[PDB]
mmCIF file of all heavy atoms in Angstrom:
data_model
loop_
_atom_site.group_PDB
_atom_site.id
_atom_site.type_symbol
_atom_site.label_atom_id
_atom_site.label_comp_id
_atom_site.label_asym_id
_atom_site.label_seq_id
_atom_site.Cartn_x
_atom_site.Cartn_y
_atom_site.Cartn_z
ATOM 1 N N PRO A 209 47.952 28.365 19.699
ATOM 2 C CA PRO A 209 46.836 27.983 20.570
ATOM 3 C C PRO A 209 46.488 29.087 21.559
ATOM 4 O O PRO A 209 47.374 29.713 22.141
ATOM 5 C CB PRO A 209 47.359 26.727 21.261
ATOM 6 C CG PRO A 209 48.182 26.096 20.181
ATOM 7 C CD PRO A 209 48.947 27.278 19.621
ATOM 8 N N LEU A 210 45.196 29.315 21.754
ATOM 9 C CA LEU A 210 44.734 30.358 22.652
ATOM 10 C C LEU A 210 44.383 29.800 24.030
ATOM 11 O O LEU A 210 43.981 28.644 24.160
ATOM 12 C CB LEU A 210 43.510 31.035 22.038
ATOM 13 C CG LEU A 210 43.596 31.260 20.525
ATOM 14 C CD1 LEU A 210 42.250 31.759 20.044
ATOM 15 C CD2 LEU A 210 44.705 32.253 20.170
ATOM 16 N N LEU A 211 44.536 30.622 25.063
ATOM 17 C CA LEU A 211 44.214 30.181 26.412
ATOM 18 C C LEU A 211 43.028 30.993 26.917
ATOM 19 O O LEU A 211 43.211 32.072 27.491
ATOM 20 C CB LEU A 211 45.436 30.358 27.334
ATOM 21 C CG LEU A 211 46.754 29.741 26.831
ATOM 22 C CD1 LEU A 211 47.880 30.043 27.818
ATOM 23 C CD2 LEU A 211 46.611 28.246 26.643
ATOM 24 N N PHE A 212 41.813 30.484 26.695
ATOM 25 C CA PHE A 212 40.609 31.198 27.133
ATOM 26 C C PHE A 212 40.434 31.054 28.632
ATOM 27 O O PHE A 212 40.578 29.968 29.179
ATOM 28 C CB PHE A 212 39.320 30.682 26.444
ATOM 29 C CG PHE A 212 39.290 30.868 24.945
ATOM 30 C CD1 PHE A 212 38.395 30.136 24.164
ATOM 31 C CD2 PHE A 212 40.161 31.749 24.312
ATOM 32 C CE1 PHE A 212 38.378 30.274 22.787
ATOM 33 C CE2 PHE A 212 40.149 31.890 22.930
ATOM 34 C CZ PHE A 212 39.255 31.151 22.167
ATOM 35 N N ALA A 213 40.132 32.167 29.290
ATOM 36 C CA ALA A 213 39.899 32.178 30.725
ATOM 37 C C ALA A 213 38.498 31.605 30.931
ATOM 38 O O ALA A 213 37.581 31.893 30.158
ATOM 39 C CB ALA A 213 39.966 33.599 31.251
ATOM 40 N N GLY A 214 38.332 30.793 31.969
ATOM 41 C CA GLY A 214 37.032 30.203 32.232
ATOM 42 C C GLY A 214 36.741 29.991 33.702
ATOM 43 O O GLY A 214 37.637 30.046 34.539
ATOM 44 N N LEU A 215 35.473 29.746 34.010
ATOM 45 C CA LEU A 215 35.035 29.518 35.381
ATOM 46 C C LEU A 215 34.196 28.243 35.413
ATOM 47 O O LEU A 215 33.234 28.090 34.654
ATOM 48 C CB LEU A 215 34.206 30.711 35.875
ATOM 49 C CG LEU A 215 34.914 32.064 36.010
ATOM 50 C CD1 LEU A 215 33.900 33.146 36.370
ATOM 51 C CD2 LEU A 215 35.999 31.969 37.076
ATOM 52 N N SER A 216 34.562 27.334 36.303
ATOM 53 C CA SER A 216 33.863 26.067 36.410
ATOM 54 C C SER A 216 33.360 25.812 37.823
ATOM 55 O O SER A 216 33.956 26.262 38.804
ATOM 56 C CB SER A 216 34.803 24.936 35.968
ATOM 57 O OG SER A 216 34.302 23.660 36.321
ATOM 58 N N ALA A 217 32.246 25.100 37.916
ATOM 59 C CA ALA A 217 31.670 24.765 39.201
ATOM 60 C C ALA A 217 32.017 23.316 39.526
ATOM 61 O O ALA A 217 31.508 22.747 40.488
ATOM 62 C CB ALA A 217 30.163 24.949 39.166
ATOM 63 N N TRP A 218 32.866 22.694 38.722
ATOM 64 C CA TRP A 218 33.214 21.322 39.041
ATOM 65 C C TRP A 218 34.295 21.333 40.118
ATOM 66 O O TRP A 218 35.102 22.260 40.196
ATOM 67 C CB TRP A 218 33.718 20.577 37.808
ATOM 68 C CG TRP A 218 34.126 19.178 38.125
ATOM 69 C CD1 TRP A 218 33.322 18.077 38.181
ATOM 70 C CD2 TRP A 218 35.445 18.727 38.451
ATOM 71 N NE1 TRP A 218 34.062 16.965 38.518
ATOM 72 C CE2 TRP A 218 35.371 17.340 38.688
ATOM 73 C CE3 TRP A 218 36.686 19.366 38.566
ATOM 74 C CZ2 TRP A 218 36.486 16.577 39.033
ATOM 75 C CZ3 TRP A 218 37.796 18.614 38.908
ATOM 76 C CH2 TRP A 218 37.691 17.231 39.137
ATOM 77 N N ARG A 219 34.283 20.313 40.968
ATOM 78 C CA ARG A 219 35.268 20.167 42.034
ATOM 79 C C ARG A 219 35.467 18.667 42.235
ATOM 80 O O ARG A 219 34.607 17.873 41.852
ATOM 81 C CB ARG A 219 34.768 20.809 43.331
ATOM 82 C CG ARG A 219 34.504 22.306 43.246
ATOM 83 C CD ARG A 219 35.776 23.145 43.194
ATOM 84 N NE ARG A 219 35.431 24.567 43.212
ATOM 85 C CZ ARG A 219 35.046 25.268 42.150
ATOM 86 N NH1 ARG A 219 34.970 24.689 40.956
ATOM 87 N NH2 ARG A 219 34.692 26.541 42.296
ATOM 88 N N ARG A 220 36.592 18.283 42.831
ATOM 89 C CA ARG A 220 36.912 16.869 43.063
ATOM 90 C C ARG A 220 35.765 16.084 43.705
ATOM 91 O O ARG A 220 35.202 16.503 44.715
ATOM 92 C CB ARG A 220 38.170 16.749 43.941
ATOM 93 C CG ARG A 220 38.872 15.380 43.888
ATOM 94 C CD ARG A 220 38.255 14.345 44.833
ATOM 95 N NE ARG A 220 38.564 14.617 46.239
ATOM 96 C CZ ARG A 220 38.081 13.921 47.268
ATOM 97 N NH1 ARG A 220 37.253 12.903 47.066
ATOM 98 N NH2 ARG A 220 38.425 14.250 48.507
ATOM 99 N N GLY A 221 35.433 14.942 43.110
ATOM 100 C CA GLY A 221 34.363 14.112 43.632
ATOM 101 C C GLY A 221 32.994 14.450 43.069
ATOM 102 O O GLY A 221 32.039 13.697 43.260
ATOM 103 N N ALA A 222 32.900 15.579 42.371
ATOM 104 C CA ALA A 222 31.641 16.022 41.780
ATOM 105 C C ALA A 222 31.389 15.361 40.433
ATOM 106 O O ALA A 222 32.324 15.017 39.710
ATOM 107 C CB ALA A 222 31.641 17.538 41.616
ATOM 108 N N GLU A 223 30.116 15.191 40.094
ATOM 109 C CA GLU A 223 29.756 14.578 38.828
ATOM 110 C C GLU A 223 29.989 15.568 37.690
ATOM 111 O O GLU A 223 29.996 16.782 37.905
ATOM 112 C CB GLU A 223 28.300 14.135 38.867
ATOM 113 C CG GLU A 223 28.064 12.827 38.151
ATOM 114 C CD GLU A 223 26.824 12.125 38.649
ATOM 115 O OE1 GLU A 223 26.736 11.874 39.873
ATOM 116 O OE2 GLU A 223 25.942 11.822 37.818
ATOM 117 N N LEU A 224 30.181 15.044 36.483
ATOM 118 C CA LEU A 224 30.439 15.876 35.310
ATOM 119 C C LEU A 224 29.165 16.258 34.561
ATOM 120 O O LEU A 224 29.024 15.992 33.364
ATOM 121 C CB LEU A 224 31.407 15.149 34.370
ATOM 122 C CG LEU A 224 32.772 14.790 34.975
ATOM 123 C CD1 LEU A 224 33.506 13.855 34.039
ATOM 124 C CD2 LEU A 224 33.588 16.043 35.227
ATOM 125 N N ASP A 225 28.245 16.896 35.279
ATOM 126 C CA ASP A 225 26.974 17.323 34.711
ATOM 127 C C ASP A 225 26.885 18.850 34.555
ATOM 128 O O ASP A 225 27.839 19.568 34.861
ATOM 129 C CB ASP A 225 25.808 16.802 35.574
ATOM 130 C CG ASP A 225 26.016 17.039 37.067
ATOM 131 O OD1 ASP A 225 26.738 17.992 37.437
ATOM 132 O OD2 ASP A 225 25.442 16.279 37.881
ATOM 133 N N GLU A 226 25.742 19.338 34.073
ATOM 134 C CA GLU A 226 25.550 20.773 33.876
ATOM 135 C C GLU A 226 25.653 21.532 35.184
ATOM 136 O O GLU A 226 26.023 22.705 35.197
ATOM 137 C CB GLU A 226 24.189 21.069 33.243
ATOM 138 C CG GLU A 226 23.869 20.207 32.057
ATOM 139 C CD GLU A 226 23.395 18.839 32.486
ATOM 140 O OE1 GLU A 226 22.990 18.703 33.665
ATOM 141 O OE2 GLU A 226 23.417 17.911 31.650
ATOM 142 N N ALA A 227 25.308 20.866 36.281
ATOM 143 C CA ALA A 227 25.378 21.482 37.597
ATOM 144 C C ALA A 227 26.828 21.815 37.925
ATOM 145 O O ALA A 227 27.103 22.638 38.803
ATOM 146 C CB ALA A 227 24.804 20.550 38.655
ATOM 147 N N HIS A 228 27.757 21.177 37.221
ATOM 148 C CA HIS A 228 29.171 21.451 37.444
ATOM 149 C C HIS A 228 29.874 21.844 36.149
ATOM 150 O O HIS A 228 31.071 21.626 35.995
ATOM 151 C CB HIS A 228 29.854 20.241 38.094
ATOM 152 C CG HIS A 228 29.263 19.867 39.417
ATOM 153 N ND1 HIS A 228 28.141 19.074 39.531
ATOM 154 C CD2 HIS A 228 29.578 20.253 40.677
ATOM 155 C CE1 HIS A 228 27.789 18.992 40.802
ATOM 156 N NE2 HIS A 228 28.644 19.700 41.519
ATOM 157 N N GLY A 229 29.120 22.441 35.228
ATOM 158 C CA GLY A 229 29.687 22.867 33.956
ATOM 159 C C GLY A 229 30.410 24.201 34.059
ATOM 160 O O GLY A 229 30.344 24.864 35.092
ATOM 161 N N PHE A 230 31.106 24.608 32.999
ATOM 162 C CA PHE A 230 31.827 25.878 33.033
ATOM 163 C C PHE A 230 31.358 26.853 31.961
ATOM 164 O O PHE A 230 30.594 26.486 31.074
ATOM 165 C CB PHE A 230 33.341 25.653 32.885
ATOM 166 C CG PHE A 230 33.767 25.164 31.522
ATOM 167 C CD1 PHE A 230 33.957 26.060 30.468
ATOM 168 C CD2 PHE A 230 34.003 23.814 31.296
ATOM 169 C CE1 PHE A 230 34.382 25.613 29.206
ATOM 170 C CE2 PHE A 230 34.427 23.354 30.046
ATOM 171 C CZ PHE A 230 34.618 24.255 28.995
ATOM 172 N N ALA A 231 31.801 28.102 32.065
ATOM 173 C CA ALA A 231 31.471 29.114 31.071
ATOM 174 C C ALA A 231 32.786 29.794 30.645
ATOM 175 O O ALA A 231 33.712 29.920 31.451
ATOM 176 C CB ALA A 231 30.506 30.139 31.659
ATOM 177 N N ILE A 232 32.885 30.206 29.382
ATOM 178 C CA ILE A 232 34.084 30.894 28.906
ATOM 179 C C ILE A 232 33.932 32.372 29.266
ATOM 180 O O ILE A 232 32.882 32.953 29.018
ATOM 181 C CB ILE A 232 34.251 30.798 27.357
ATOM 182 C CG1 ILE A 232 34.310 29.336 26.914
ATOM 183 C CG2 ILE A 232 35.539 31.488 26.915
ATOM 184 C CD1 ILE A 232 35.274 28.519 27.735
ATOM 185 N N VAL A 233 34.955 32.977 29.870
ATOM 186 C CA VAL A 233 34.873 34.404 30.214
ATOM 187 C C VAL A 233 34.909 35.187 28.904
ATOM 188 O O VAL A 233 35.837 35.030 28.115
ATOM 189 C CB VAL A 233 36.052 34.872 31.074
ATOM 190 C CG1 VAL A 233 35.931 36.374 31.339
ATOM 191 C CG2 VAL A 233 36.087 34.100 32.380
ATOM 192 N N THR A 234 33.892 36.018 28.688
ATOM 193 C CA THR A 234 33.759 36.826 27.480
ATOM 194 C C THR A 234 33.767 38.340 27.756
ATOM 195 O O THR A 234 33.377 38.795 28.833
ATOM 196 C CB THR A 234 32.448 36.485 26.748
ATOM 197 O OG1 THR A 234 31.358 36.565 27.675
ATOM 198 C CG2 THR A 234 32.506 35.069 26.170
ATOM 199 N N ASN A 235 34.187 39.109 26.757
ATOM 200 C CA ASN A 235 34.249 40.558 26.862
ATOM 201 C C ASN A 235 33.092 41.149 26.082
ATOM 202 O O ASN A 235 33.270 41.673 24.978
ATOM 203 C CB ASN A 235 35.567 41.060 26.283
ATOM 204 C CG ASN A 235 35.836 42.511 26.613
ATOM 205 O OD1 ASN A 235 36.882 43.048 26.253
ATOM 206 N ND2 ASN A 235 34.895 43.155 27.302
ATOM 207 N N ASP A 236 31.904 41.062 26.666
ATOM 208 C CA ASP A 236 30.684 41.549 26.036
ATOM 209 C C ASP A 236 30.761 42.986 25.523
ATOM 210 O O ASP A 236 30.256 43.292 24.441
ATOM 211 C CB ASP A 236 29.517 41.391 27.016
ATOM 212 C CG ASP A 236 29.227 39.932 27.346
ATOM 213 O OD1 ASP A 236 30.193 39.145 27.483
ATOM 214 O OD2 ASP A 236 28.034 39.571 27.477
ATOM 215 N N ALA A 237 31.403 43.859 26.294
ATOM 216 C CA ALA A 237 31.535 45.265 25.921
ATOM 217 C C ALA A 237 32.016 45.479 24.484
ATOM 218 O O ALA A 237 31.593 46.425 23.818
ATOM 219 C CB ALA A 237 32.479 45.970 26.891
ATOM 220 N N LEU A 238 32.897 44.605 24.010
ATOM 221 C CA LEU A 238 33.426 44.736 22.656
ATOM 222 C C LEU A 238 32.744 43.811 21.658
ATOM 223 O O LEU A 238 33.111 43.778 20.484
ATOM 224 C CB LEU A 238 34.932 44.470 22.653
ATOM 225 C CG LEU A 238 35.708 45.394 23.593
ATOM 226 C CD1 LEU A 238 37.174 44.998 23.593
ATOM 227 C CD2 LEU A 238 35.531 46.849 23.145
ATOM 228 N N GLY A 239 31.751 43.066 22.129
ATOM 229 C CA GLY A 239 31.030 42.154 21.259
ATOM 230 C C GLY A 239 31.908 41.069 20.662
ATOM 231 O O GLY A 239 32.961 40.739 21.205
ATOM 232 N N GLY A 240 31.470 40.506 19.545
ATOM 233 C CA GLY A 240 32.247 39.471 18.899
ATOM 234 C C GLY A 240 33.381 40.074 18.088
ATOM 235 O O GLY A 240 33.459 41.295 17.928
ATOM 236 N N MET A 241 34.267 39.222 17.582
ATOM 237 C CA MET A 241 35.388 39.683 16.775
ATOM 238 C C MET A 241 34.852 40.084 15.399
ATOM 239 O O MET A 241 35.362 41.010 14.774
ATOM 240 C CB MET A 241 36.432 38.562 16.645
ATOM 241 C CG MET A 241 37.789 38.988 16.087
ATOM 242 S SD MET A 241 38.676 40.187 17.120
ATOM 243 C CE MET A 241 39.092 39.163 18.508
ATOM 244 N N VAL A 242 33.812 39.389 14.945
ATOM 245 C CA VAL A 242 33.202 39.660 13.644
ATOM 246 C C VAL A 242 31.728 40.042 13.788
ATOM 247 O O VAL A 242 31.256 40.970 13.129
ATOM 248 C CB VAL A 242 33.301 38.425 12.714
ATOM 249 C CG1 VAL A 242 32.725 38.753 11.355
ATOM 250 C CG2 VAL A 242 34.750 37.985 12.583
ATOM 251 N N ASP A 243 31.014 39.313 14.647
ATOM 252 C CA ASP A 243 29.592 39.553 14.908
ATOM 253 C C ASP A 243 29.430 40.440 16.130
ATOM 254 O O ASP A 243 29.706 40.021 17.254
ATOM 255 C CB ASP A 243 28.861 38.222 15.125
ATOM 256 C CG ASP A 243 27.455 38.408 15.678
ATOM 257 O OD1 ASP A 243 26.804 39.418 15.345
ATOM 258 O OD2 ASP A 243 26.988 37.534 16.437
ATOM 259 N N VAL A 244 28.965 41.664 15.908
ATOM 260 C CA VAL A 244 28.790 42.626 16.989
ATOM 261 C C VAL A 244 27.786 42.184 18.058
ATOM 262 O O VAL A 244 27.727 42.765 19.136
ATOM 263 C CB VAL A 244 28.366 44.004 16.432
ATOM 264 C CG1 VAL A 244 29.409 44.502 15.457
ATOM 265 C CG2 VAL A 244 27.010 43.906 15.753
ATOM 266 N N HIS A 245 27.004 41.155 17.763
ATOM 267 C CA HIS A 245 26.022 40.657 18.718
ATOM 268 C C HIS A 245 26.555 39.469 19.523
ATOM 269 O O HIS A 245 25.866 38.936 20.400
ATOM 270 C CB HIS A 245 24.738 40.245 17.990
ATOM 271 C CG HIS A 245 23.917 41.402 17.511
ATOM 272 N ND1 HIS A 245 24.476 42.551 16.997
ATOM 273 C CD2 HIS A 245 22.575 41.573 17.438
ATOM 274 C CE1 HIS A 245 23.515 43.379 16.626
ATOM 275 N NE2 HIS A 245 22.353 42.809 16.883
ATOM 276 N N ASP A 246 27.776 39.042 19.219
ATOM 277 C CA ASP A 246 28.362 37.917 19.936
ATOM 278 C C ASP A 246 29.256 38.441 21.050
ATOM 279 O O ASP A 246 29.352 39.650 21.273
ATOM 280 C CB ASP A 246 29.158 37.021 18.975
ATOM 281 C CG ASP A 246 29.164 35.553 19.403
ATOM 282 O OD1 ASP A 246 29.255 35.267 20.622
ATOM 283 O OD2 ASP A 246 29.088 34.679 18.513
ATOM 284 N N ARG A 247 29.911 37.525 21.743
ATOM 285 C CA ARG A 247 30.770 37.883 22.857
ATOM 286 C C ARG A 247 32.132 37.232 22.683
ATOM 287 O O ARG A 247 32.266 36.018 22.818
ATOM 288 C CB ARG A 247 30.106 37.410 24.153
ATOM 289 C CG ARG A 247 28.731 38.034 24.392
ATOM 290 C CD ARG A 247 27.878 37.186 25.322
ATOM 291 N NE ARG A 247 27.204 36.119 24.592
ATOM 292 C CZ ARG A 247 26.155 36.308 23.790
ATOM 293 N NH1 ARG A 247 25.642 37.522 23.637
ATOM 294 N NH2 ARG A 247 25.604 35.282 23.154
ATOM 295 N N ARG A 248 33.147 38.032 22.390
ATOM 296 C CA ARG A 248 34.476 37.474 22.188
ATOM 297 C C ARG A 248 35.045 36.923 23.485
ATOM 298 O O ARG A 248 34.864 37.499 24.553
ATOM 299 C CB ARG A 248 35.424 38.524 21.613
ATOM 300 C CG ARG A 248 35.897 39.554 22.615
ATOM 301 C CD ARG A 248 36.751 40.595 21.926
ATOM 302 N NE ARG A 248 35.986 41.341 20.928
ATOM 303 C CZ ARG A 248 36.490 42.314 20.176
ATOM 304 N NH1 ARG A 248 37.769 42.655 20.299
ATOM 305 N NH2 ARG A 248 35.716 42.940 19.301
ATOM 306 N N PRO A 249 35.740 35.783 23.404
ATOM 307 C CA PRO A 249 36.344 35.144 24.577
ATOM 308 C C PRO A 249 37.628 35.840 25.012
ATOM 309 O O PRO A 249 38.438 36.241 24.182
ATOM 310 C CB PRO A 249 36.599 33.722 24.094
ATOM 311 C CG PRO A 249 36.974 33.945 22.656
ATOM 312 C CD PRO A 249 35.913 34.943 22.204
#
């Protein structure tokens, strides 16, 4: 199992909506693992 680093705007008491959604930290510089136009996590 992999442990992807991420950043979330959710906090205790906050609703579980897009306003408090998260994003996976990606290494754009190296692109995807297979697709050079993607972003590997």
